[PDB]
Design a binder for these strands. Structure first.
Ligand SMILES: [Zn+2]
Ligand SMILES: [Zn+2]
Ligand SMILES: [Zn+2]
Ligand SMILES: [Zn+2]
Ligand SMILES: [Zn+2]
Ligand SMILES: [Zn+2]
Lengths: 90, 94
DNA sequence: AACCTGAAAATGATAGTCTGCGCGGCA
DNA sequence: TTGCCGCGCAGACTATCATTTTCAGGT
DNA sequence: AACCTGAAAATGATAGTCTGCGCGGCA
DNA sequence: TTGCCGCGCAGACTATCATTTTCAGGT
C-alpha cells in the first residue's frame, strides 16, 4: 500500500492518486483549476472541481418538483424538500 | 473543537487529551512509561500502555477454548482460532 | 402593529471517504 | 486468448462551514 | 530418509481511531 | 434533583511490522 510521510499522519491509501491528493492537503496544493472566466478557484480533487463547475451553468442539474428551484448536490435537494415538508407540517 | 496548530496538519479532535496525544507525534514524546523492572518501555497513549502491561502479568486476559493458551488482544485470539479452524478443516478434508 | 434584533433555518459551496467500472499491463 | 492485477476515473454519500433568508421575540 | 533451507503461517507487539460509559461540574 | 455539557477511560477495532514457528521444496 501507500502511507503518508507527514510527521504525525500515519494514514494509508490503496492507490498512488489517493496518497497524492491527501498529501496536497498538507502542502495546501490545489492542482485542479476551474477553467471558468473569473472563477480561478482551485481544488485538491477532481470530483470537487467537477462539482464546482455546476455553479457556473445557468440551469443547475437537479430539480424540485414543487417550487421549480434547481440544485447541484442530491443533499441540497433533499434538504430543500425536508424544509418544504417541515413547512407543510407547520 | 480542538485543532492541531502544527503546520499543514489540519487534524481535529473533540477532546484535549486526544489533541495532546496526537501532538506527541510531532514532538516524538512518549509520556506513559512502563513501571516494570527491566522494561522501561514508553508509549504515546495510556491505552497503549494499558495493553502493554499485560505482557508482564502472569495470566493474560483472552483465552483459547481449545488449547487453553492465553492472549492479550481480541485480534490475537481471533487469528489464533482461525488458524485452528483452517488446520481442522484441512485435515478433515484429508 | 411597523419596528427592529439576534436566533433559527434554509441555502450554497466544498472538503473526505467509499464503491464499482473499465482499461491497459502482466503472466 | 486469457483472466488477474494496479490503477485512475466517475459518482455517490456525509460532514462541515459560510452566506442568505426566514422567523420569532420584544418594542 | 532425514536433510537442510527459505517460504509461509503463526504469533506478538504497537500504532491510530471509534463508541459508549460514567463522572464531575454547573445552571 | 433535573438534565446538559465536557471530559477521560475502557473496550473494541483495524492495520502494520517484527519475531517465531511451522511447513513444503529440492536434495
Ligand atoms: Zn498525511
Ligand atoms: Zn469556477
Ligand atoms: Zn422546492
Ligand atoms: Zn498535528
Ligand atoms: Zn513493560
Ligand atoms: Zn488454541
Amino acid at each position: 500500500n501507500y502511507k503518508c510521510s507527514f510527521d504525525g499522519c500515519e494514514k494509508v491509501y490503496n492507490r498512488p492518486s489517493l496518497l497524492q491528493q491527501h498529501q496536497n492537503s498538507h502542502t495546501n496544493q490545489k492542482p485542479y483549476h476551474c477553467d471558468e472566466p473569473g472563477c480561478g478557484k482551485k481544488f485538491i480533487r477532481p470530483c470537487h472541481l467537477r462539482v464546482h463547475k455546476w455553479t457556473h451553468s445557468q440551469i443547475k442539474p437537479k430539480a424540485c418538483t414543487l417550487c421549480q428551484k434547481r440544485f447541484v448536490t442530491n443533499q441540497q435537494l433533499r434538504r430543500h424538500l425536508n424544509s418544504h415538508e417541515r413547512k407543510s407540517k407547520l
